Amino acid sequence: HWGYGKHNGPEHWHKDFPIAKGERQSPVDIDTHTAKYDPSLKPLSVSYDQATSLRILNNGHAFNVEFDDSQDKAVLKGGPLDGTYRLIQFHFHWGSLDGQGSEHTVDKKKYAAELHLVHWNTKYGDFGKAVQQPDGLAVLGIFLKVGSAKPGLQKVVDVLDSIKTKGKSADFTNFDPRGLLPESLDYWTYPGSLTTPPLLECVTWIVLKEPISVSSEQVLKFRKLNFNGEGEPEELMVDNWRPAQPLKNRQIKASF
Numbered sequence: 001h002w003g004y005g006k007h008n009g010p011e012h013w014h015k016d017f018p019i020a021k022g023e024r025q026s027p028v029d030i031d032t033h034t035a036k037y038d039p040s041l042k043p044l045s046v047s048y049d050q051a052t053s054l055r056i057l058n059n060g061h062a063f064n065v066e067f068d069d070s071q072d073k074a075v076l077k078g079g080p081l082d083g084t085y086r087l088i089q090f091h092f093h094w095g096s097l098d099g100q101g102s103e104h105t106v107d108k109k110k111y112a113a114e115l116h117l118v119h120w121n122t123k124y125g126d127f128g129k130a131v132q133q134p135d136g137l138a139v140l141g142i143f144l145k146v147g148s149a150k151p152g153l154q155k156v157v158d159v160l161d162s163i164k165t166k167g168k169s170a171d172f173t174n175f176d177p178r179g180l181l182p183e184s185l186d187y188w189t190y191p192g193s194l195t196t197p198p199l200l201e202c203v204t205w206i207v208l209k210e211p212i213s214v215s216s217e218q219v220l221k222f223r224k225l226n227f228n229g230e231g232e233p234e235e236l237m238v239d240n241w242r243p244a245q246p247l248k249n250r251q252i253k254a255s256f
């Protein structure tokens with residue numbers, strides 16, 4: 001089934017998911033000299049003070065930190081969005097080496113990793129309904145570069161040893177996602193898709209301009225995770241990123 005290796009990787013996904021060759025696929029390269037500054041674009045409103053994290057899980061493709069989304073606790077509003085989008089989970093994509101790992105690129109520059117905070121439009125009532133709609137999800141993407149340690153990331157790094165292999169999960173309460181935000185919330189936005197199967201074209205992408213920095217030893221611990229389940233041959237979970245897709249009939253807008 002799908003993965004990131006030679007035999008089941010991104011170049012093969014269209015055989016099982018024909019929308020892989022669709023008109024609003026993600027990620028894309030953001031060319032900064034062609035993005036249009038749009039003065040109509042409102043500031044983002046990130047209200048994460050009431051976030052309740054529950055669990056961290058290795059799902060064989062990345063690891064997800066899951067949030068309670070039964071009520072409007074942690075939400076995203078404003079920017080290009082109409083309505084309220086609830087945070088349900090975040091995960092990362094990263095590389096085997098510091099010069100690759102992000103899915104979006106900026107003037108073809110690749111970063112060491114990319115954080116995706118996934119939110120769904122509450123007017124559709126549940127998550128499963130929201131992914132079937134063109135404005136169902138909003139994903140906030142943040143680039144990670146290697147430099148100084150990010151204090152707010154260390155609790156995540158410390159629990160990775162307990163979810164080394166696919167299917168493992170651990171309780172992960174009281175984690176505050178505000179510790180993962182850059183100082184500035186300036187952004188680019190465009191209409192796109194999920195970057196993994198099922199590749200549904202339901203996402204409004206909001207990619208922040210400012211990277212956060214993490215240390216070398218923090219990103220090193222991501223690279224020790226396993227794609228495989230326990231008792232199977234070890235394959236290190238690295239390079240779980242999709243390459244940039246054609247922009248086609250789309251415009252990237254900048255808030256700045």
Ligand SMILES: CCN[C@H]1C[C@H](C)S(=O)(=O)c2sc(S(N)(=O)=O)cc21
Pocket residue numbers: 059061089116118131139193194195196197198
């Ligand atoms: C491993 C499958 N992950 C898929 C399906 C999940 C149900 S989701 O939350 O819709 C989601 S969000 C993204 S991404 N990389 O575009 O942010 C990929 C996925």
Ligand SMILES: [Zn+2]
Pocket residue numbers: 091092093116195
């Ligand atoms: Zn992602």
